[PDB]
Amino acid sequence: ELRQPGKNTRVEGEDATIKAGSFTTMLNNFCQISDETLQVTGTADKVKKAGRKNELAYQLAKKSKELKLDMEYAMVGAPQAKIQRNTTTPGQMANIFAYYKTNGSVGANGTLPTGDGSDTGTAGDLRLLTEDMLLNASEAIWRNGGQANSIQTSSSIKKAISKNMKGRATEITLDASDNRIAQTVDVYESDFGKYTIRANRWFHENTMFIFDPKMHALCYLRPFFQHELAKTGDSEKRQLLVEYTLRVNNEKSGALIRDVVAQV
Amino acid sequence: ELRQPGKNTRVEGEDATIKAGSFTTMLNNFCQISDETLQVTGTADKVKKAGRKNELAYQLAKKSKELKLDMEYAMVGAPQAKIQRNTTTPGQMANIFAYYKTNGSVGANGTLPTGDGSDTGTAGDLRLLTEDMLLNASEAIWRNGGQANSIQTSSSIKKAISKNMKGRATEITLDASDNRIAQTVDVYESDFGKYTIRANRWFHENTMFIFDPKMHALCYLRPFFQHELAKTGDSEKRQLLVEYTLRVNNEKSGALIRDVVAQV
Amino acid sequence: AISKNMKGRATEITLDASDNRIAQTVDVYESDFGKYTIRANRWFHENTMFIFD
Amino acid sequence: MATPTNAVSTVEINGKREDLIDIIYNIAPYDTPFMTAIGKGVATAITHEWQTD
Description:
The structure is cut from a larger assembly and holds four copies of chain A.
Chain A: E1 32-41, H1 55-76, E2 127-128, H2 131-143, E3 150-153, H3 155-163, E4 173-175, E5 180-183, E6 187-189, E7 194-199, E8 207-211, E9 216-228, E10 235-248, E11 255-258, E12 260-261
Parallel strand pairs in A: 2-12, 3-7
Antiparallel strand pairs in A: 1-10, 3-8, 6-7, 8-11, 9-10
């Protein structure tokens, strides 16, 4: 980042005085391992059943879908702080709840995260969702030069926004001849940015996230794979594994509003 | 159905831990019989009449129409719970009122059905129709992954909706110079779904049904037919029979709102 | 009376302030169950209305 | 949580090459709207003066 301007008046013919420069900042994240296991007895694969030819493939497909859902939840489901792996303790991811601390807002008696990813702070008292939070977040993003253009939140907050938002309005009129009734709010505009609002099934409740998709990355240390375990009897065992990490390019480009309740 | 995501942090290189899978759920329904009978004397079929040539077919057509109407009423006319048949008890099938218990709503001191089809619950006190009922139903349907696009209700509820719906709007405007008055509400749209509202003559009052046509089937054990009875005099008798049942694929793809009244 | 106060489903009935013409007449009534054209009859019995085909 | 006892893991072995991406992320803004709006000119002395009426 750059430095704040100052007086900078200087004196004519002066011997040059050296001014200190600016240095970069280091950030890092750890890796996480996810897995899923399955065991099916031999006799269950031979009996005739309705809708399935082989039970193993059915269960394996369901487990793979659940593993992808687990990866998404680990990404955005709940706050998470980085933990260094050890021979007795698991290694943990640092998600978005442990990085964004500048342009966001927190409830009363709440503490912001440090910013390195080692902690996520403490939650505050819930408050009603107002447009002032969105306006302040957009202004803060604009001040820091961010280019966020996407908004994601839980289904309840999306429902609350669509039902009663009335941005800079007081009437909300509808023609009597119109035969269609719609409750849909997707695009938010202001002097500082343009955003599209979308709902996420697995998003953490009482949270809103304004972000630029290009400033986040998911890095695979080991791409998702699977293998079969050792045969020790009349059953078959399978396992699937993946190893991943998450990188946030710059915290200043987004905002995270927490402890916001919808529909009172 | 699938399961909710969780922590899923895992430890490097540990012995694989086996966790249980998911299992399906079984649903079933019974069959029921409907009939009609007609007897016409020989004299009535010989005299001249205005508008008819043969009395028997003239009555039989109306009897068949009434049988179809009775089938429709058995489907949606009133709540019904399945009853096993014996030598003294008629067999009864279960309609939609005994299957939908997830995305719907009931009045105060109301009880939801069990779900198997053995009971329909207890009705609550009537309450006014509001926008948030439909909005919450749509959100619940969207959360469970259902894809419904039809709404059906009684004539009185359709009249009430078309009069004072005003979804998301605080006022309705009409041009003073306009000479056309219209009262028509057909399509309800939100960020979670989109439905078209239609009125049913035989629908149960104080009920609204949001559903998808592709998830409901009518199964004929014996297709509708008719036959001759024994002759015991100067008269002719006919009988008509049908045997059917109803299958609901998944109650999570629709909603059933109960105990709503047009006027307090 | 019908043209005086109908306001079908409406709540405001607005009129432009700059409009120099005032019109007060209702001819077509449309609902979910039918469409009707309203006409007055000189010889019709008083205090009666007839909806018919 | 076993991490079998004599298994060679990331903890034991040495010489892991560090990964550091070659991109530096800077989005600090730098704009001077007032400089762009106002006009430009040339001064030829320490003191620059003009008149008004």
